[PDB]
């Protein structure tokens, strides 16, 4: 089949606002954890800033659908920031939604430290809209090496299908932090490996839904999804946004249709 990809430069709000109830499968969410100057004529904290989108993100998310939120958990209390904890802590009180899975990307590198235990981890809190969301395993089981499930398959304790099939990757994910030397660079600071971004895609979307970000940053959702036979739609705030966006085409330089403008997010919405 042939995927549709929308994207355009939006408030996530006035994104959100456009799409109809339960319209998207999946949706990718790196949120900033701070609130922009404007923002305190309305708000006096992040999560009230925050809980708008996140409303909205419930709204737009079909039955079976899911969100994936990256955050940390080292907050120090600044006004107008927070973390993944102040995010769960919200969802506990005012969703309805199901905490499927707490993520723990730990990545190998990163500064070191002399005063406290050198950070190499960060969150991703995997909701689910209700207890029928999708979910496809095998999709991203960690296969074994030809000899070690050669051993499995010689001891008849085990289960031969799940020897085959592979293991289940765990809720702890040892991936690599995008390095500035790699290919995927876009420009985008704090642009997301692409490994993290497609297991969430294969295991929390089937093919040819729609996968939403309207924090898209580096465009990376957009990628990919179109790798994954999925529609997307991505938008950013930033008008960078643009260029990040086809500087991530033209990396991919088997078919699908791109359609910039919110007024075509239809288009990544026909199920097909
Ligand atoms: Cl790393
Ligand atoms: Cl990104």
Redesign the pocket.
């Known amino acids: 089949g042939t995927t549709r990809h929308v994207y355009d430069v939006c408030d996530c709000l006035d994104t959100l606002a456009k799409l109809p109830d339960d319209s998207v499968q999946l949706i990718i969410c790196?949120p900033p954890y701070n609130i922009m100057p404007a923002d305190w004529d309305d708000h006096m904290d992040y999560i009230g800033w925050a809980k708008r989108w996140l409303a909205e993100a419930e709204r737009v998310l079909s039955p079976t659908g899911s969100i994936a939120i990256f955050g940390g958990l080292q907050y120090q209390g600044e006004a107008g920031s927070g973390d993944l904890i102040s995010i769960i802590s919200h969802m506990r009180q005012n969703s309805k939604m199901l905490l499927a899975n707490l993520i723990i990307w730990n990545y190998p590198n990163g500064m070191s430290a002399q005063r406290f235990f050198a950070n190499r981890h960060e969150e991703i809190a995997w909701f689910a809209k209700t207890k029928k969301y999708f979910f496809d395993l095998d999709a991203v089981r960690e296969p074994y090496d030809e000899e070690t499930k050669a051993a499995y398959m010689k001891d008849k304790r085990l289960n031969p299908e799940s020897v085959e099939k592979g293991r289940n990757p765990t809720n702890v994910w040892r991936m690599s932090r995008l390095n500035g030397n790699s290919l995927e660079r876009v420009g985008?600071p704090?642009?997301?490996p692409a490994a993290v971004i497609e297991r969430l895609v294969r295991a929390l979307s089937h093919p040819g839904s729609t996968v939403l970000d309207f924090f898209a940053?580096?465009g990376?959702t957009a990628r990919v999804a179109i790798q994954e036979g999925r529609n997307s739609i991505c938008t950013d705030a930033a008008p960078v946004f643009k260029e990040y966006y086809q500087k991530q085409l033209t990396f991919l330089q088997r078919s699908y249709e791109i359609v910039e403008g919110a007024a075509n997010f239809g288009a990544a919405l026909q199920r097909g």
């Open positions: 790196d985008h704090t642009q997301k940053g580096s990376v």
